[PDB]
mmCIF file of all heavy atoms in Angstrom:
data_model
loop_
_atom_site.group_PDB
_atom_site.id
_atom_site.type_symbol
_atom_site.label_atom_id
_atom_site.label_comp_id
_atom_site.label_asym_id
_atom_site.label_seq_id
_atom_site.Cartn_x
_atom_site.Cartn_y
_atom_site.Cartn_z
ATOM 1 N N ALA G 1 0.812 -1.257 0.008
ATOM 2 C CA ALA G 1 0.011 -0.033 0.006
ATOM 3 C C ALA G 1 0.814 1.273 0.013
ATOM 4 O O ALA G 1 1.940 1.333 0.545
ATOM 5 C CB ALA G 1 -0.995 -0.027 1.159
ATOM 6 N N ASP G 2 0.354 2.376 -0.644
ATOM 7 C CA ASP G 2 1.073 3.606 -0.532
ATOM 8 C C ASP G 2 0.373 4.619 0.407
ATOM 9 O O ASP G 2 0.914 5.682 0.616
ATOM 10 C CB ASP G 2 1.276 4.166 -1.969
ATOM 11 C CG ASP G 2 0.012 4.501 -2.739
ATOM 12 O OD1 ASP G 2 -1.170 4.413 -2.082
ATOM 13 O OD2 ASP G 2 0.103 4.818 -3.979
ATOM 14 N N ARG G 3 -0.825 4.269 0.890
ATOM 15 C CA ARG G 3 -1.403 5.062 1.985
ATOM 16 C C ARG G 3 -2.227 4.102 2.860
ATOM 17 O O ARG G 3 -2.854 3.142 2.397
ATOM 18 C CB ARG G 3 -2.251 6.156 1.435
ATOM 19 C CG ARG G 3 -2.871 7.042 2.592
ATOM 20 C CD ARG G 3 -3.581 8.290 1.980
ATOM 21 N NE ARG G 3 -4.857 7.919 1.285
ATOM 22 C CZ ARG G 3 -4.968 7.778 -0.096
ATOM 23 N NH1 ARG G 3 -3.946 8.000 -0.853
ATOM 24 N NH2 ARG G 3 -6.172 7.510 -0.517
ATOM 25 N N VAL G 4 -2.200 4.370 4.138
ATOM 26 C CA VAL G 4 -2.949 3.553 5.146
ATOM 27 C C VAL G 4 -3.764 4.545 6.045
ATOM 28 O O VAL G 4 -3.241 5.516 6.428
ATOM 29 C CB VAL G 4 -2.049 2.688 6.028
ATOM 30 C CG1 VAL G 4 -2.871 1.899 7.090
ATOM 31 C CG2 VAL G 4 -1.217 1.627 5.095
ATOM 32 N N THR G 5 -5.027 4.138 6.268
ATOM 33 C CA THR G 5 -5.921 4.905 7.108
ATOM 34 C C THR G 5 -6.481 3.953 8.174
ATOM 35 O O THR G 5 -7.024 2.884 7.795
ATOM 36 C CB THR G 5 -7.091 5.466 6.214
ATOM 37 O OG1 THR G 5 -6.487 6.383 5.327
ATOM 38 C CG2 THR G 5 -8.019 6.248 7.097
ATOM 39 N N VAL G 6 -6.283 4.379 9.454
ATOM 40 C CA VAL G 6 -6.750 3.539 10.553
ATOM 41 C C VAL G 6 -7.858 4.396 11.293
ATOM 42 O O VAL G 6 -7.578 5.517 11.825
ATOM 43 C CB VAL G 6 -5.603 3.249 11.534
ATOM 44 C CG1 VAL G 6 -6.116 2.490 12.860
ATOM 45 C CG2 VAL G 6 -4.474 2.431 10.800
ATOM 46 N N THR G 7 -9.073 3.831 11.343
ATOM 47 C CA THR G 7 -10.158 4.478 11.958
ATOM 48 C C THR G 7 -10.450 3.588 13.175
ATOM 49 O O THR G 7 -10.666 2.439 13.044
ATOM 50 C CB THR G 7 -11.384 4.532 11.117
ATOM 51 O OG1 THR G 7 -11.094 5.049 9.800
ATOM 52 C CG2 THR G 7 -12.571 5.312 11.801
ATOM 53 N N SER G 8 -10.440 4.201 14.338
ATOM 54 C CA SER G 8 -10.569 3.451 15.582
ATOM 55 C C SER G 8 -11.449 4.114 16.608
ATOM 56 O O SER G 8 -11.467 5.347 16.718
ATOM 57 C CB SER G 8 -9.196 3.021 16.148
ATOM 58 O OG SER G 8 -9.197 2.066 17.214
ATOM 59 N N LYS G 9 -12.119 3.375 17.448
ATOM 60 C CA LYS G 9 -12.967 3.777 18.509
ATOM 61 C C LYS G 9 -12.855 2.911 19.749
ATOM 62 O O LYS G 9 -13.167 1.690 19.636
ATOM 63 C CB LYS G 9 -14.461 3.896 18.088
ATOM 64 C CG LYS G 9 -15.509 4.160 19.205
ATOM 65 C CD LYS G 9 -15.481 5.569 19.737
ATOM 66 C CE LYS G 9 -16.640 5.834 20.715
ATOM 67 N NZ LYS G 9 -16.268 5.268 22.047
ATOM 68 N N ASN G 10 -12.355 3.447 20.863
ATOM 69 C CA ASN G 10 -12.152 2.727 22.111
ATOM 70 C C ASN G 10 -13.366 3.226 23.053
ATOM 71 O O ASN G 10 -13.719 4.418 22.971
ATOM 72 C CB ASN G 10 -10.776 3.028 22.722
ATOM 73 C CG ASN G 10 -10.541 2.343 24.086
ATOM 74 O OD1 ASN G 10 -11.002 2.932 25.111
ATOM 75 N ND2 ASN G 10 -9.810 1.280 24.164
ATOM 76 N N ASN G 11 -13.803 2.380 23.985
ATOM 77 C CA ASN G 11 -14.889 2.750 24.833
ATOM 78 C C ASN G 11 -14.649 4.075 25.662
ATOM 79 O O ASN G 11 -15.615 4.766 25.943
ATOM 80 C CB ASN G 11 -15.289 1.639 25.799
ATOM 81 C CG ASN G 11 -16.142 0.553 25.186
ATOM 82 O OD1 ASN G 11 -16.636 0.733 24.078
ATOM 83 N ND2 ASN G 11 -16.204 -0.599 25.896
ATOM 84 N N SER G 12 -13.447 4.317 25.987
ATOM 85 C CA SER G 12 -12.978 5.478 26.785
ATOM 86 C C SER G 12 -12.750 6.702 26.043
ATOM 87 O O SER G 12 -12.354 7.751 26.662
ATOM 88 C CB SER G 12 -11.665 5.090 27.469
ATOM 89 O OG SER G 12 -11.807 4.152 28.584
ATOM 90 N N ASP G 13 -12.968 6.721 24.709
ATOM 91 C CA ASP G 13 -12.590 7.968 23.984
ATOM 92 C C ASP G 13 -13.448 8.119 22.766
ATOM 93 O O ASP G 13 -14.416 7.313 22.605
ATOM 94 C CB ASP G 13 -11.060 7.866 23.620
ATOM 95 C CG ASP G 13 -10.404 9.207 23.265
ATOM 96 O OD1 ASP G 13 -11.173 10.218 23.122
ATOM 97 O OD2 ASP G 13 -9.158 9.364 23.157
ATOM 98 N N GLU G 14 -13.321 9.206 21.990
ATOM 99 C CA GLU G 14 -13.995 9.482 20.745
ATOM 100 C C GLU G 14 -13.301 8.658 19.655
ATOM 101 O O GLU G 14 -12.276 8.117 19.847
ATOM 102 C CB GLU G 14 -13.838 10.974 20.323
ATOM 103 C CG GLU G 14 -14.096 12.075 21.300
ATOM 104 C CD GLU G 14 -13.741 13.397 20.802
ATOM 105 O OE1 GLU G 14 -14.085 13.792 19.630
ATOM 106 O OE2 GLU G 14 -13.030 14.183 21.568
ATOM 107 N N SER G 15 -13.997 8.656 18.516
ATOM 108 C CA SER G 15 -13.399 8.075 17.315
ATOM 109 C C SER G 15 -12.357 8.976 16.642
ATOM 110 O O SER G 15 -12.604 10.175 16.584
ATOM 111 C CB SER G 15 -14.572 7.762 16.366
ATOM 112 O OG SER G 15 -14.110 6.979 15.262
ATOM 113 N N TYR G 16 -11.260 8.393 16.130
ATOM 114 C CA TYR G 16 -10.233 9.169 15.393
ATOM 115 C C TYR G 16 -9.855 8.418 14.150
ATOM 116 O O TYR G 16 -9.931 7.176 14.146
ATOM 117 C CB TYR G 16 -9.008 9.374 16.307
ATOM 118 C CG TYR G 16 -9.253 10.229 17.470
ATOM 119 C CD1 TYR G 16 -9.652 9.616 18.727
ATOM 120 C CD2 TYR G 16 -9.240 11.610 17.411
ATOM 121 C CE1 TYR G 16 -9.991 10.398 19.771
ATOM 122 C CE2 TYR G 16 -9.580 12.381 18.465
ATOM 123 C CZ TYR G 16 -9.874 11.753 19.645
ATOM 124 O OH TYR G 16 -10.174 12.539 20.769
ATOM 125 N N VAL G 17 -9.244 9.093 13.188
ATOM 126 C CA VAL G 17 -8.706 8.549 12.036
ATOM 127 C C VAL G 17 -7.169 8.906 11.961
ATOM 128 O O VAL G 17 -6.813 10.079 11.903
ATOM 129 C CB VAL G 17 -9.373 9.065 10.731
ATOM 130 C CG1 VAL G 17 -8.764 8.446 9.504
ATOM 131 C CG2 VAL G 17 -10.849 8.791 10.827
ATOM 132 N N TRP G 18 -6.337 7.838 11.891
ATOM 133 C CA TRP G 18 -4.916 8.035 11.723
ATOM 134 C C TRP G 18 -4.619 7.807 10.263
ATOM 135 O O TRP G 18 -5.256 7.015 9.591
ATOM 136 C CB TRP G 18 -4.209 6.896 12.526
ATOM 137 C CG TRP G 18 -2.679 6.778 12.462
ATOM 138 C CD1 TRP G 18 -1.824 7.089 13.403
ATOM 139 C CD2 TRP G 18 -1.877 6.114 11.413
ATOM 140 N NE1 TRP G 18 -0.505 6.750 13.088
ATOM 141 C CE2 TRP G 18 -0.594 6.137 11.802
ATOM 142 C CE3 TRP G 18 -2.190 5.519 10.189
ATOM 143 C CZ2 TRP G 18 0.455 5.660 11.098
ATOM 144 C CZ3 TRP G 18 -1.115 5.051 9.414
ATOM 145 C CH2 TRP G 18 0.201 5.056 9.874
ATOM 146 N N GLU G 19 -3.721 8.661 9.668
ATOM 147 C CA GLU G 19 -3.426 8.466 8.213
ATOM 148 C C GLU G 19 -1.996 8.775 7.925
ATOM 149 O O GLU G 19 -1.496 9.769 8.421
ATOM 150 C CB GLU G 19 -4.325 9.318 7.412
ATOM 151 C CG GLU G 19 -4.186 9.085 5.926
ATOM 152 C CD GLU G 19 -5.278 9.765 5.169
ATOM 153 O OE1 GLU G 19 -5.081 10.937 4.798
ATOM 154 O OE2 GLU G 19 -6.295 9.114 4.828
ATOM 155 N N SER G 20 -1.377 7.922 7.049
ATOM 156 C CA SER G 20 -0.080 8.238 6.584
ATOM 157 C C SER G 20 0.212 7.640 5.219
ATOM 158 O O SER G 20 -0.204 6.481 4.945
ATOM 159 C CB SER G 20 1.050 7.825 7.621
ATOM 160 O OG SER G 20 2.345 8.170 7.194
ATOM 161 N N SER G 21 0.966 8.388 4.434
ATOM 162 C CA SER G 21 1.526 7.867 3.239
ATOM 163 C C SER G 21 3.092 7.738 3.327
ATOM 164 O O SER G 21 3.753 7.772 2.342
ATOM 165 C CB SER G 21 1.319 8.763 1.995
ATOM 166 O OG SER G 21 0.030 9.347 1.988
ATOM 167 N N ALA G 22 3.559 7.649 4.584
ATOM 168 C CA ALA G 22 5.033 7.356 4.866
ATOM 169 C C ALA G 22 5.957 8.524 4.367
ATOM 170 O O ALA G 22 7.098 8.269 3.868
ATOM 171 C CB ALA G 22 5.510 6.026 4.236
ATOM 172 N N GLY G 23 5.502 9.733 4.419
ATOM 173 C CA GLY G 23 6.308 10.875 4.043
ATOM 174 C C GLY G 23 6.954 11.508 5.223
ATOM 175 O O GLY G 23 7.573 12.625 5.119
ATOM 176 N N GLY G 24 7.011 10.868 6.393
ATOM 177 C CA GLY G 24 7.666 11.372 7.527
ATOM 178 C C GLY G 24 6.695 11.805 8.622
ATOM 179 O O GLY G 24 7.156 12.110 9.722
ATOM 180 N N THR G 25 5.418 11.962 8.238
ATOM 181 C CA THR G 25 4.411 12.378 9.198
ATOM 182 C C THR G 25 3.155 11.510 9.025
ATOM 183 O O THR G 25 2.918 10.906 8.066
ATOM 184 C CB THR G 25 3.977 13.893 8.960
ATOM 185 O OG1 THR G 25 3.374 13.949 7.666
ATOM 186 C CG2 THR G 25 5.127 14.924 9.132
ATOM 187 N N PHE G 26 2.305 11.634 10.077
ATOM 188 C CA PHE G 26 0.955 11.059 9.995
ATOM 189 C C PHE G 26 -0.065 12.067 10.540
ATOM 190 O O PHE G 26 0.376 13.085 11.207
ATOM 191 C CB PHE G 26 0.840 9.681 10.771
ATOM 192 C CG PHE G 26 1.139 9.840 12.273
ATOM 193 C CD1 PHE G 26 0.044 10.061 13.095
ATOM 194 C CD2 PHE G 26 2.390 9.694 12.807
ATOM 195 C CE1 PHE G 26 0.223 10.151 14.520
ATOM 196 C CE2 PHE G 26 2.564 9.756 14.197
ATOM 197 C CZ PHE G 26 1.497 9.958 14.999
ATOM 198 N N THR G 27 -1.303 11.907 10.153
ATOM 199 C CA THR G 27 -2.334 12.836 10.735
ATOM 200 C C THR G 27 -3.263 12.141 11.606
ATOM 201 O O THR G 27 -3.443 10.940 11.470
ATOM 202 C CB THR G 27 -3.159 13.580 9.623
ATOM 203 O OG1 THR G 27 -3.722 12.596 8.796
ATOM 204 C CG2 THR G 27 -2.187 14.553 8.779
ATOM 205 N N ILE G 28 -3.832 12.858 12.616
ATOM 206 C CA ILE G 28 -4.896 12.348 13.428
ATOM 207 C C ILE G 28 -6.122 13.329 13.249
ATOM 208 O O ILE G 28 -5.963 14.516 13.459
ATOM 209 C CB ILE G 28 -4.564 12.312 14.961
ATOM 210 C CG1 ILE G 28 -3.382 11.370 15.221
ATOM 211 C CG2 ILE G 28 -5.851 12.026 15.777
ATOM 212 C CD1 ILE G 28 -3.731 9.808 14.960
ATOM 213 N N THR G 29 -7.209 12.791 12.732
ATOM 214 C CA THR G 29 -8.411 13.558 12.361
ATOM 215 C C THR G 29 -9.609 13.207 13.228
ATOM 216 O O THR G 29 -9.886 11.991 13.580
ATOM 217 C CB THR G 29 -8.854 13.350 10.892
ATOM 218 O OG1 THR G 29 -7.762 13.825 10.030
ATOM 219 C CG2 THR G 29 -10.119 14.077 10.484
ATOM 220 N N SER G 30 -10.258 14.251 13.784
ATOM 221 C CA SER G 30 -11.422 14.120 14.618
ATOM 222 C C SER G 30 -12.591 14.920 14.032
ATOM 223 O O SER G 30 -12.359 16.037 13.473
ATOM 224 C CB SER G 30 -11.167 14.584 16.036
ATOM 225 O OG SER G 30 -10.351 15.702 16.113
ATOM 226 N N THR G 31 -13.840 14.472 14.090
ATOM 227 C CA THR G 31 -15.030 15.191 13.709
ATOM 228 C C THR G 31 -15.990 15.154 14.835
ATOM 229 O O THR G 31 -16.070 14.154 15.598
ATOM 230 C CB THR G 31 -15.633 14.623 12.318
ATOM 231 O OG1 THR G 31 -16.101 13.294 12.471
ATOM 232 C CG2 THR G 31 -14.530 14.581 11.244
ATOM 233 N N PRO G 32 -16.883 16.225 15.033
ATOM 234 C CA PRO G 32 -17.596 16.273 16.326
ATOM 235 C C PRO G 32 -18.722 15.210 16.456
ATOM 236 O O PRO G 32 -18.927 14.682 17.543
ATOM 237 C CB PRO G 32 -18.116 17.708 16.403
ATOM 238 C CG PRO G 32 -18.229 18.080 14.929
ATOM 239 C CD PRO G 32 -17.141 17.345 14.176
ATOM 240 N N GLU G 33 -19.384 14.875 15.338
ATOM 241 C CA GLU G 33 -20.171 13.667 15.276
ATOM 242 C C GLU G 33 -19.280 12.678 14.605
ATOM 243 O O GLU G 33 -18.997 12.785 13.424
ATOM 244 C CB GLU G 33 -21.442 13.788 14.548
ATOM 245 C CG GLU G 33 -22.485 14.847 15.033
ATOM 246 C CD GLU G 33 -23.207 15.433 13.808
ATOM 247 O OE1 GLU G 33 -22.635 16.264 13.113
ATOM 248 O OE2 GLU G 33 -24.352 15.072 13.629
ATOM 249 N N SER G 34 -18.732 11.771 15.398
ATOM 250 C CA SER G 34 -17.833 10.750 14.854
ATOM 251 C C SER G 34 -18.561 9.399 15.053
ATOM 252 O O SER G 34 -19.463 9.339 15.845
ATOM 253 C CB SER G 34 -16.486 10.815 15.523
ATOM 254 O OG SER G 34 -16.542 11.262 16.861
ATOM 255 N N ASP G 35 -18.133 8.398 14.307
ATOM 256 C CA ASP G 35 -18.859 7.131 14.346
ATOM 257 C C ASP G 35 -18.653 6.545 15.829
ATOM 258 O O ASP G 35 -17.722 6.810 16.601
ATOM 259 C CB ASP G 35 -18.316 6.158 13.304
ATOM 260 C CG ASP G 35 -17.569 4.962 13.829
ATOM 261 O OD1 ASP G 35 -16.405 5.135 14.137
ATOM 262 O OD2 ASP G 35 -18.259 3.887 13.933
ATOM 263 N N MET G 36 -19.673 5.687 16.195
ATOM 264 C CA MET G 36 -19.807 5.271 17.597
ATOM 265 C C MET G 36 -19.428 3.781 17.825
ATOM 266 O O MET G 36 -19.368 3.352 18.994
ATOM 267 C CB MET G 36 -21.288 5.539 18.068
ATOM 268 C CG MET G 36 -21.446 6.951 18.649
ATOM 269 S SD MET G 36 -20.569 7.210 20.181
ATOM 270 C CE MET G 36 -21.194 5.869 21.240
ATOM 271 N N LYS G 37 -19.117 3.024 16.696
ATOM 272 C CA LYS G 37 -18.905 1.630 16.774
ATOM 273 C C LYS G 37 -17.475 1.287 17.313
ATOM 274 O O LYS G 37 -16.497 1.612 16.742
ATOM 275 C CB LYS G 37 -19.018 1.022 15.391
ATOM 276 C CG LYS G 37 -19.271 -0.459 15.348
ATOM 277 C CD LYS G 37 -19.836 -0.913 13.925
ATOM 278 C CE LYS G 37 -21.251 -0.262 13.659
ATOM 279 N NZ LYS G 37 -21.720 -0.512 12.258
ATOM 280 N N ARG G 38 -17.416 0.605 18.448
ATOM 281 C CA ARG G 38 -16.192 0.182 19.039
ATOM 282 C C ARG G 38 -15.392 -0.666 18.003
ATOM 283 O O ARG G 38 -16.007 -1.551 17.380
ATOM 284 C CB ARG G 38 -16.393 -0.629 20.322
ATOM 285 C CG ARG G 38 -15.179 -1.124 21.067
ATOM 286 C CD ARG G 38 -15.472 -2.255 21.964
ATOM 287 N NE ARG G 38 -15.812 -3.500 21.194
ATOM 288 C CZ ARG G 38 -17.014 -4.076 21.226
ATOM 289 N NH1 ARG G 38 -18.033 -3.582 21.887
ATOM 290 N NH2 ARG G 38 -17.191 -5.135 20.512
ATOM 291 N N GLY G 39 -14.101 -0.450 17.879
ATOM 292 C CA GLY G 39 -13.210 -1.304 16.999
ATOM 293 C C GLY G 39 -12.267 -0.444 16.134
ATOM 294 O O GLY G 39 -12.033 0.703 16.466
ATOM 295 N N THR G 40 -11.740 -1.142 15.098
ATOM 296 C CA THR G 40 -10.713 -0.567 14.242
ATOM 297 C C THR G 40 -10.918 -0.986 12.816
ATOM 298 O O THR G 40 -11.136 -2.167 12.593
ATOM 299 C CB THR G 40 -9.286 -0.918 14.760
ATOM 300 O OG1 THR G 40 -9.144 -0.473 16.111
ATOM 301 C CG2 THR G 40 -8.233 -0.384 13.872
ATOM 302 N N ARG G 41 -10.777 -0.119 11.819
ATOM 303 C CA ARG G 41 -10.750 -0.461 10.373
ATOM 304 C C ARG G 41 -9.425 0.010 9.897
ATOM 305 O O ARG G 41 -9.115 1.166 10.084
ATOM 306 C CB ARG G 41 -11.945 0.108 9.627
ATOM 307 C CG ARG G 41 -13.242 -0.159 10.266
ATOM 308 C CD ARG G 41 -14.468 0.244 9.361
ATOM 309 N NE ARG G 41 -14.186 1.508 8.737
ATOM 310 C CZ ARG G 41 -14.734 2.706 9.044
ATOM 311 N NH1 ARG G 41 -15.651 2.722 9.997
ATOM 312 N NH2 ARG G 41 -14.391 3.778 8.377
ATOM 313 N N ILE G 42 -8.647 -0.866 9.281
ATOM 314 C CA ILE G 42 -7.354 -0.549 8.609
ATOM 315 C C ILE G 42 -7.710 -0.582 7.143
ATOM 316 O O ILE G 42 -8.146 -1.629 6.650
ATOM 317 C CB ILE G 42 -6.230 -1.503 8.946
ATOM 318 C CG1 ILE G 42 -6.143 -2.019 10.421
ATOM 319 C CG2 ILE G 42 -4.859 -1.002 8.496
ATOM 320 C CD1 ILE G 42 -5.606 -1.056 11.436
ATOM 321 N N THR G 43 -7.459 0.513 6.485
ATOM 322 C CA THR G 43 -7.773 0.573 5.034
ATOM 323 C C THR G 43 -6.519 0.884 4.291
ATOM 324 O O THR G 43 -5.828 1.934 4.498
ATOM 325 C CB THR G 43 -8.800 1.617 4.590
ATOM 326 O OG1 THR G 43 -10.052 1.265 5.314
ATOM 327 C CG2 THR G 43 -9.032 1.669 3.138
#
């Protein structure tokens, strides 16, 4: 893969999206209505 996105939700916190294309940085994105389903999707 040339980009990976990890969307995760833990019972103790809000949902976040981690993203990186391996250019030396990654981003963490939050939205105020975020999905509520506990777990992780790696795309």
Side-chain angles (χ1 to χ4, degrees):
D2 62 10
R3 184 173 72 260
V4 176
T5 299
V6 175
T7 308
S8 192
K9 170 75 173 80
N10 176 280
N11 280 347
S12 284
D13 200 350
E14 313 171 46
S15 188
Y16 296 93
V17 179
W18 177 105
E19 187 170 83
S20 185
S21 320
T25 61
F26 63 92
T27 57
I28 297 295
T29 298
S30 39
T31 68
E33 302 147 283
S34 30
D35 115 282
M36 274 292 301
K37 198 163 297 172
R38 182 201 69 247
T40 299
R41 309 189 320 254
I42 316 286
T43 298

